[PDB]
Structures are given as structure tokens and as C-alpha cells.
From Swiss-Prot, chain A:
Associates with the gamma-tubulin ring complex (gTuRC) consisting of TUBGCP2, TUBGCP3, TUBGCP4, TUBGCP5 and TUBGCP6 and gamma-tubulin TUBG1 or TUBG2; within the complex, interacts with TUBGCP2; the interaction plays a role in gTuRC activation. Required for the recruitment and the assembly of the gamma-tubulin ring complex (gTuRC) at the centrosome. The gTuRC regulates the minus-end nucleation of alpha-beta tubulin heterodimers that grow into microtubule protafilaments, a critical step in centrosome duplication and spindle formation. The gene is MZT2A. It comes from the Eukaryota. The chain holds residues 35 to 80 of 158 of the full protein. It is found in: Cytoplasm, Cytoskeleton, Microtubule organizing center, Centrosome; Cytoplasm, Cytoskeleton, Spindle. Belongs to the MOZART2 family. Coiled coil: none annotated. This is Mitotic-spindle organizing protein 2A.
UniProtKB/Swiss-Prot annotation, chain B:
Component of the gamma-tubulin ring complex (gTuRC) which mediates microtubule nucleation. The gTuRC regulates the minus-end nucleation of alpha-beta tubulin heterodimers that grow into microtubule protafilaments, a critical step in centrosome duplication and spindle formation. The chain holds residues 364 to 424 of 907 of the full protein. It comes from Homo sapiens. It comes from the Eukaryota. This is Gamma-tubulin complex component 3. Ubiquitously expressed.
UniProtKB/Swiss-Prot annotation, chain E:
Belongs to the TUBGCP family. It comes from the Eukaryota. Component of the gamma-tubulin ring complex (gTuRC) consisting of TUBGCP2, TUBGCP3, TUBGCP4, TUBGCP5 and TUBGCP6 and gamma-tubulin TUBG1 or TUBG2. TUBGCP2, TUBGCP3, TUBGCP4, TUBGCP5 and TUBGCP6 assemble in a 5:5:2:1:1 stoichiometry; each is associated with a gamma-tubulin, thereby arranging 14 gamma-tubulins in a helical manner. Gamma-tubulin at the first position is blocked by TUBGCP3 at the last position, allowing 13 protafilaments to grow into a microtubule. It is found in: Cytoplasm, Cytoskeleton, Microtubule organizing center, Centrosome. It is linked to Cortical dysplasia, complex, with other brain malformations 15: An autosomal recessive disorder characterized by global developmental delay, variably impaired intellectual development, speech delay, facial dysmorphism, microcephaly, and varying degrees of cortical malformations including pachygyria, thin corpus callosum and subcortical band heterotopia. Most patients have generalized seizures. Component of the gamma-tubulin ring complex (gTuRC) which mediates microtubule nucleation. The gTuRC regulates the minus-end nucleation of alpha-beta tubulin heterodimers that grow into microtubule protafilaments, a critical step in centrosome duplication and spindle formation. Plays a role in neuronal migration. The lineage of its organism: Eukaryota, Metazoa, Chordata, Craniata, Vertebrata. The chain holds residues 388 to 516 of 902 of the full protein. This is Gamma-tubulin complex component 2. Ubiquitously expressed.
Length: 46, 61, 35, 95, 129, 35
């Protein structure tokens, strides 16, 4: 994580992920990804 | 507007630009004033460019 | 669901043009620096 | 282009065929900015009312921060509807 | 938009405070003639992705790729220029002034290959290989 | 042949591209050391 928008937002309401995967998902917002596709690809395997 | 403000505000727009700009252009002679006028030509302010062109051309001339 | 039996042609030349290019080139991005 | 660190490594980092097809399913375009969020998705934090003042106050501060990455988190605020299918793995990982 | 105008219709980067979406650096020496690796999009010429608005980001690659065609053959021997020049300014619920970008890009493309295909002619030069 | 051997070979060729992406992942992190 190690960022103000990567770490503080990941534990606001209920929180809880893998930290490296949460940092990768926080970095994926800057990678111009479609919000639904990455979550669908994660949910179709997890 | 309060007293006298509107036709003293018009001067203030003529004057406050110089009170910053000539205070950045202190001491520079010859082409060194022209290199300051480069940095002030690349200014972000678009109206101040035309409003000070009268003096900026008497640097360039 | 049902398969139209023609898109595999385009898929074969697609994977060929990606994989064989990348396979030989990426390894010899070493050679450009190692040689 | 750079799918090694954030697609290949992110696909490999999952604890669970679609091993290589997950990157094609999550094939992001770097030239886009098309968030599917709306203002209706702001009520997703209201379900987690353990301390709702410090669950509703964070969003204005995250918007007041100068990053534009707060927009795609509409589906990520709801996250998984399964019971702790991402959150509970950290307790096993910490051991 | 006046800085954009100079970059779209001429090969000139005006560069106000470096807050415009395109800027030029002197990376030219890294890969001067050939694109040995890429140079004219993120490196020698670079786009600050967040310094573009929304109604222009939809074709900011074409903005970044318009002016280069006006300022790579200027070094090589033809005055590649756009005599079309349509002033860019905001208007209520309108972006036709950004719709002008396509015409200027295609015109820069037209004069660039109007050099390249017939002076240093690729259609006859390339045959050699 | 039973219309899955050919597509299994196709999926193997997708796995080849994934292996080339993994080699790209090792290559772009070895770029930082000596060069």
C-alpha cells in the first residue's frame, strides 16, 4: 500500500483484503481499467 | 462601491502588475532584461501580457 | 455455444504473429546488450 | 503493454482453464477513463455502521485529496457479498 | 486552447508553465534517426495524461500525434505546414472546436506522407530490401 | 480428434503467451541491475 489513497480507503467502512492485492487493486485505478472487468475476472476464479 | 473605488481600481490593474514585474526585473541590463522578458512572456496570465506590452516592447526595441 | 468453424484461422495467425515474434525477440533483447 | 506487474503478477498472486484467460477477461485499455460509478453508490458504506461517522467522513477527504483514483471504487466499496472471502485470508496469512 | 492551436496547426510547442498536455525534452540524442525504441510519444515528446481535459482526452493521442508530423520533416527538407487554422475557444455544451482536431491531424498526416511517399519515396525506396 | 484436442492445443498456445509474459516480467526486472 504505502499511500494515502491506497491504505486509508482500504480499511474505512468494514475493510479487509490481502494487502499486496489491495495495493494492486488501488494501482489498477491508475491503470485506466474498467471497474467491472477486473472484479469479474477476480470473482470468476476466486 | 465604498468611496472612489471603481476609478482607483482601474489604476490598480495598471499598477499592481508593475509592482510585481519590475520588482522581478530589477538590475537586469541589455539582453539580461530580455531574458527576464522571456520568462514574463511565458507568463500564465493572458490579459497581463497585452496590458504590459507597451513596456515589454520598449524592452525589446 | 455453437462454433462457426472459421475464426480459428484468424486465431492461428494471431497467435503465430504474437508468440513467434515475441519468443525470438524478447530473448534477443538480451543479445542487444550482452553482445 | 505493461501487463507483467499488474495483470500477470496480479493473476498469479491469487490463492486459487482461466489461468491465462483471466488477464484477457481483465484486459484493461490504458487510453480510457470510463468509470461506471454514480452518486447512488455513495450509500454502500451505510451497511457497515460499526462507526458510521468515521465511515461517511472519509469520502470527502479522499475527494479533497488531489488523486483522481477514487472514482472506480463504486463496486469495490460493496466488494464481495460472500462472507469474508477476501478479508479473512489475512488472518491466515499473518500466521 | 491558444497553446493547443499553435501545436495543432504549426510544429510549435508554446509550453505555458509546462501545464499544457504536450511538452518537448532533448531525448532526441538517445535514438535520433530510427525509433530504436519509441521516442515521439512519452519520451522526447511526452504527454502528461492528467493535464488533458475530458472532451479532448478522447483523442489526445491524435493531438500528441498531429504536431510531430509538422516538426520532423521541417528538419529534413520540406516545409510541412497546415494552412488551415481554426481558432479554439470554449462554448456552452459544445466541442465542435475539438472536432476540428481530426481535420488538422489528417492534414498533418497528408502533408507528411505527401513528402514521404514521393520525396525519399518509400513506395520505391523500400523495394531495395 | 474430438473437437477439444485442437482447442486444448490452442489453450496451450495461450499458455505459451503467458509464459512469454512471465519471461517479460523477469526481463524487465533484470533490466535494473547492471544496465
Amino acid at each position: 500500500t504505502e499511500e494515502m489513497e491506497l491504505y486509508e480507503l482500504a480499511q474505512a467502512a468494514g475493510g479487509g483484503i490481502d494487502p499486496d492485492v489491495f495495493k494492486i487493486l488501488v494501482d489498477l485505478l491508475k491503470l485506466n481499467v474498467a471497474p467491472l472487468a477486473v472484479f469479474q475476472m477476480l470473482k470468476s476464479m476466486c | 462601491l465604498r468611496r472612489l473605488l471603481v476609478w482607483t481600481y482601474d489604476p490598480k490593474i495598471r499598477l499592481k502588475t508593475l509592482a510585481a514585474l519590475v520588482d522581478h526585473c530589477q538590475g537586469r541590463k541589455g539582453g539580461e532584461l530580455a531574458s527576464a522578458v522571456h520568462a514574463y512572456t511565458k507568463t500564465g496570465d493572458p490579459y497581463m501580457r497585452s496590458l504590459v506590452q507597451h513596456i515589454l516592447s520598449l524592452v525589446s526595441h | 455455444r455453437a462454433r462457426n468453424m472459421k475464426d480459428f484461422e484468424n486465431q492461428i495467425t494471431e497467435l503465430k504473429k504474437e508468440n513467434f515474434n515475441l519468443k525470438l525477440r524478447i530473448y534477443f533483447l538480451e543479445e542487444r546488450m550482452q553482445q | 503493454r505493461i501487463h507483467h506487474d499488474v495483470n500477470e503478477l496480479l493473476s498469479l498472486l491469487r490463492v486459487h482453464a482461466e489461468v491465462y484467460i483471466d488477464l484477457l477477461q481483465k484486459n484493461r485499455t490504458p487510453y480510457v477513463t470510463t468509470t461506471v460509478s454514480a452518486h447512488s453508490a455513495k450509500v454502500k458504506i451505510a451497511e457497515f455502521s460499526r462507526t458510521p461517522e468515521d465511515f461517511l467522513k472519509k469520502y470527502d477527504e479522499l475527494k479533497s485529496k488531489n488523486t483522481r483514483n477514487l472514482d472506480p471504487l463504486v463496486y469495490l466499496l460493496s466488494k464481495l457479498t460472500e462472507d469474508k472471502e477476501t478479508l479473512q485470508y489475512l488472518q491466515q496469512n499473518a500466521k | 486552447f491558444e497553446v493547443l492551436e499553435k501545436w495543432i496547426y504549426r510544429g510549435i510547442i508554446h509550453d505555458p508553465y509546462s501545464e499544457f498536455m504536450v511538452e518537448e525534452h532533448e531525448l532526441r540524442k538517445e535514438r535520433i534517426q530510427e525509433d530504436y525504441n519509441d521516442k515521439y510519444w512519452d519520451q522526447r515528446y511526452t504527454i502528461v495524461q492528467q493535464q488533458i481535459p475530458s472532451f479532448l482526452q478522447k483523442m489526445a493521442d491524435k493531438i500528441l500525434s498531429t504536431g510531430k508530423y509538422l516538426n520532423v520533416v521541417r528538419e529534413c527538407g520540406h516545409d510541412v505546414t497546415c494552412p488551415v487554422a481554426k481558432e479554439i475557444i470554449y462554448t456552452l455544451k459544445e466541442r465542435a472546436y475539438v472536432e476540428q482536431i481530426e481535420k488538422a491531424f489528417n492534414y498533418a498526416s497528408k502533408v507528411l506522407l505527401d513528402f514521404l511517399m514521393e520525396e525519399k519515396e518509400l513506395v520505391a525506396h523500400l523495394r531495395s530490401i
